From a paper:
Allopurinol, widely used in gout treatment, is the most common cause of severe cutaneous adverse drug reactions. The risk of developing such life-threatening reactions is increased particularly for HLA-B*58:01 positive individuals. Despite the known pharmacogenetic association, the precise mode of interaction between allopurinol and HLA-B*58:01 remains unknown. Taken together, this data demonstrates that allopurinol, and to a lesser extent oxypurinol, may enable the loading of unconventional peptides that are normally suboptimal in forming stable peptide-HLA-B*58:01 complexes.
The 8mer VSFIEFVG was also synthesized, together with an 8mer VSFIEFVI with isoleucine as PΩ, so as to be consistent with the KAGQVVTI peptide PΩ residue. In contrast the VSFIEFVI peptide readily formed successful complex with HLA-B*58:01 with 10 µg/ml allopurinol. The P2-Ser of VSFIEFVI being a favored anchor residue was able to function like P2-Ala of KAGQVVTI in providing stability at the N-terminal part of the peptide, and this facilitated the other peptide residues to engage and form bonding interactions with the HLA-B*58:01 molecule. While an 8mer is of sufficient length to occupy both binding pockets of the peptide binding groove, only P2-Ala of KAGQVVTI and P2-Ser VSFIEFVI engages the binding pocket. The P5-Glu has only one hydrogen bond with Arg97 on the β sheet, and P6-Phe with Gln155 on the α2 helix. The overlay of allopurinol-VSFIEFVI-B*58:01 and oxypurinol-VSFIEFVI-B*58:01 showed remarkable similarity, suggesting that even though oxypurinol is less efficient than allopurinol in facilitating peptide binding to HLA-B*58:01, once loaded, the peptide orientation is very similar.
Residue numbers in the entry:
A (entry chain C): 1 to 8
B (entry chain A): 1 to 277
C (entry chain B): 1 to 99
The structure:
């Protein structure tokens, strides 16, 4: 399962 | 043995040709199991291995929701990167991300990973402690400060030690007949004269899984590293891989050369020679 | 800033004339990801060609497998034609059944 993304 | 799960994300801007494209793939070891493409007619997380198909609608809906949201976040990240590098809105740029977990032979977390790149160059990486960051440049230091303030590393640590390992172990069980089966290489040596006094010996490995393999040529028992041509390991298209290694040798000296093959599917390393029968 | 593709052209199984097989063109080591790959039979573009989903290696360079079913013969020539921003003209790599 995938995880979330973060804004750079 | 040891196993890994990895997601690979690519986001590419294309000014004048719409919003950036986002592609995600997921692998267990050398087996792809999911994909997502924002340019698809109907973008969805889709299965790419037989053992993931049994996951229920909540799985596919949730992964699709997450990947769609990731695509939107990467569109913002591409805009931010332009500001961080003083770049114009006219060029095409790429952000890539790879993350996931490695398991040791006991099934416990060996280490976690989360790294990003901009235009093919390292940008930021989560350190092995799963608590601090290594930034490649002064732009990535801005991101590092932002992610320290938002406790991003702690969120990643919780995923990498928790869901990442738990789901990897589930995939390994559901896919055990393939993911937990090593296929050894089928090996042979071919001989191709180059001239009247030299010939190429080419050691072949075919049909093996996983992709990690070592092929080496020895002359009189000494490795010929600087004289061996070694092709990149390449996919056959049936899950297995292929590789070869070649040396040019003096005619009449062929029997002084041995090829050595190491692979997880072999009980013991193999030694082969050219067999002129 | 950019990396040019490595190209290998090969079959899924050892070639035997008259026996159906798969012709593969594996492009790797390139950046950025946009790339044009054609498989050729006697110089003509093969229409039914599939490719893998875009992924990349630990050094961030991309790789793709293009493939099509084919039945090799003694006389038919096969090749892969690759274009990429790093190339001033397309690169053609001929299939050699011993490579």
């Amino acid at each position: 399962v995938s995880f979330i993304e973060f804004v750079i | 043995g040891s196993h890994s799960m990895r997601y690979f994300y690519t986001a590419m801007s294309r000014p004048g040709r719409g919003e950036p494209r986002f592609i995600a793939v997921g692998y267990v070891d050398d087996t792809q199991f999911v994909r997502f493409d924002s340019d698809a007619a109907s973008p969805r997380t889709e299965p790419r291995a037989p053992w993931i198909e049994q996951e229920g609608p909540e799985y596919w809906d949730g992964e699709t929701r997450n990947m769609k949201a990731s695509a939107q976040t990467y569109r913002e990240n591409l805009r931010i990167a332009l500001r961080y590098y003083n770049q114009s809105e006219a060029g095409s740029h790429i952000i890539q991300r790879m993350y996931g977990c490695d398991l040791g032979p006991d099934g416990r977390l060996l280490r976690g990973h989360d790294q990003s790149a901009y235009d093919g160059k390292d940008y930021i990486a989560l350190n092995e402690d799963l608590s601090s960051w290594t930034a490649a440049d002064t732009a990535a230091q801005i991101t590092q400060r932002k992610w320290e303030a938002a406790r991003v590393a702690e969120q990643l640590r919780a995923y990498l030690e928790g869901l990442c390992v738990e789901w990897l172990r589930r995939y390994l069980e559901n896919g055990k007949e393939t993911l937990q089966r090593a296929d050894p290489p089928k090996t042979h040596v071919t001989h191709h004269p180059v001239s009247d006094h030299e010939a190429t010996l080419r050691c072949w490995a075919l049909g093996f899984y996983p992709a990690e393999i070592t092929l080496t040529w020895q002359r009189d028992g000494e490795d010929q590293t600087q004289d061996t041509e070694l092709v990149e390991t390449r996919p056959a298209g049936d899950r297995t891989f292929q590789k070869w290694a070649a040396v040019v040798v003096p005619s009449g000296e062929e029997q002084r050369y041995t090829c050595h093959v190491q692979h997880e599917g072999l009980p013991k390393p193999l030694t082969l020679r050219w067999e002129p029968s | 800033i950019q990396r040019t593709p490595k190209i290998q052209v090969y079959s899924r199984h050892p070639a035997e004339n008259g026996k159906s097989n798969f012709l593969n063109c594996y492009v790797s080591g390139f950046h950025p990801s946009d790339i044009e790959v054609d498989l050729l039979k006697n110089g003509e573009r093969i229409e039914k060609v599939e490719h893998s989903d875009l992924s990349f290696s630990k050094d961030w360079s991309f790789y793709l497998l293009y493939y099509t079913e084919f039945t090799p013969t003694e006389k038919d020539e096969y090749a892969c034609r690759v274009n990429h921003v790093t190339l001033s003209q397309p690169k053609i790599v001929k299939w050699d059944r011993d490579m």
